[PDB]
Amino acid sequence: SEKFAFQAEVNRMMKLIINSLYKNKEIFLRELISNASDALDKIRLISLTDENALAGNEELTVKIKCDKEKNLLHVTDTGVGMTREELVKNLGTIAKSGTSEFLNKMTEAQEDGQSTSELIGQFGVGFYSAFLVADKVIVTSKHNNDTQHIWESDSNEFSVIADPRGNTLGRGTTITLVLKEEASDYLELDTIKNLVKKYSQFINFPIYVWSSKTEKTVWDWELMN
């Protein structure tokens, strides 16, 4: 277990973003899906140049799941996944070149009143919008060149620890959200299914949502796109 603090710029960008979308929280799910999407492309492309790319988990899916009892929301993809170093640099710092660009474009557009929603998605920095509805955000990730790890933060800091459960993902990443009190509605299946459906009609991968039929009840992944 090792704790860290966010780069300054990432603290600023976290706020802009939480500010930009303050009245359209639902967008946090749009992004979490996009990211997943991107992650799955990453590996697919990689499967072109490597015969063992999918050896860890032969699937390429995105699977949402609500846990009302424990107040949790999960969004797992069998994408490329992240190594320990990337969890710390990609989430805790301004690693890319296009991220700095977004910090500038965002402040210039936000000042002249122009639409920003598109900016966040444009530069894929949408991950931080998860703090709009979550008190705690946890990212479990297994990548082919490392072991499984856990990242967790309440935005005031973050920490990374190797996952004591061992490689349970195969390959991929799980974004676990500890929902705020005012977001307990995102735990309702019907609410989640419409939002997932609404933001995945452009994903090149199948997106499932652990659902119930129903007293006899049957639970199973339901294809949404």
Side-chain angles (χ1 to χ4, degrees), residues 1-2 4-41 43-50 52-57 60-88 90-95 97-110 112-200 203 205-212 214 217-225:
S1 178
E2 178 179 26
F4 304 74
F6 290 89
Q7 196 177 322
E9 289 77 357
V10 159
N11 280 312
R12 311 208 173 84
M13 169 169 61
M14 270 201 266
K15 295 168 178 176
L16 293 182
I17 291 168
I18 291 185
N19 175 272
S20 163
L21 312 177
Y22 196 64
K23 295 176 191 300
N24 294 279
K25 292 175 178 54
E26 62 274 15
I27 291 186
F28 82 90
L29 190 50
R30 186 190 74 176
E31 290 314 297
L32 290 195
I33 283 182
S34 290
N35 294 338
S37 186
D38 300 353
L40 292 166
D41 284 311
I43 191 69
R44 174 199 194 172
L45 286 182
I46 299 178
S47 83
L48 285 184
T49 72
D50 177 35
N52 304 317
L54 309 181
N57 188 307
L60 297 185
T61 58
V62 160
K63 299 173 167 175
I64 288 73
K65 181 162 57 188
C66 305
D67 199 315
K68 298 184 55 176
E69 296 188 61
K70 305 187 193 64
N71 192 68
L72 300 188
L73 186 62
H74 305 282
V75 179
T76 306
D77 67 60
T78 32
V80 63
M82 289 184 277
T83 64
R84 176 176 167 302
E85 199 196 311
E86 306 181 309
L87 277 174
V88 176
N90 285 47
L91 297 179
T93 77
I94 298 302
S97 166
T99 300
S100 296
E101 197 181 308
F102 167 98
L103 266 60
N104 291 306
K105 296 166 69 74
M106 186 65 177
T107 55
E108 293 178 299
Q110 206 160 16
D112 302 334
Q114 306 171 293
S115 199
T116 57
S117 157
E118 301 78 23
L119 276 177
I120 300 168
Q122 260 190 43
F123 294 92
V125 295
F127 169 68
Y128 305 107
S129 58
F131 288 123
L132 276 162
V133 301
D135 279 328
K136 190 78 160 292
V137 175
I138 306 163
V139 179
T140 302
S141 191
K142 170 61 177 68
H143 182 298
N144 292 333
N145 286 322
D146 210 326
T147 48
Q148 190 163 303
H149 287 54
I150 301 187
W151 180 98
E152 55 103 1
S153 150
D154 67 359
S155 79
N156 292 129
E157 62 170 350
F158 76 89
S159 80
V160 186
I161 76 180
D163 193 318
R165 296 171 297 193
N167 159 31
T168 66
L169 293 178
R171 190 197 61 256
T173 304
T174 295
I175 305 288
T176 294
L177 303 189
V178 177
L179 299 176
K180 293 173 174 294
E181 186 168 298
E182 332 78 67
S184 63
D185 180 54
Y186 292 96
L187 293 170
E188 299 294 300
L189 294 187
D190 54 302
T191 304
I192 282 301
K193 291 198 296 179
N194 281 58
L195 292 172
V196 171
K197 205 170 184 184
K198 168 182 180 172
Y199 298 127
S200 60
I203 309 314
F205 301 104
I207 291 175
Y208 307 101
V209 170
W210 192 236
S211 283
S212 65
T214 291
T217 307
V218 192
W219 299 75
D220 205 50
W221 301 104
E222 190 189 307
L223 179 62
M224 301 289 113
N225 68 347

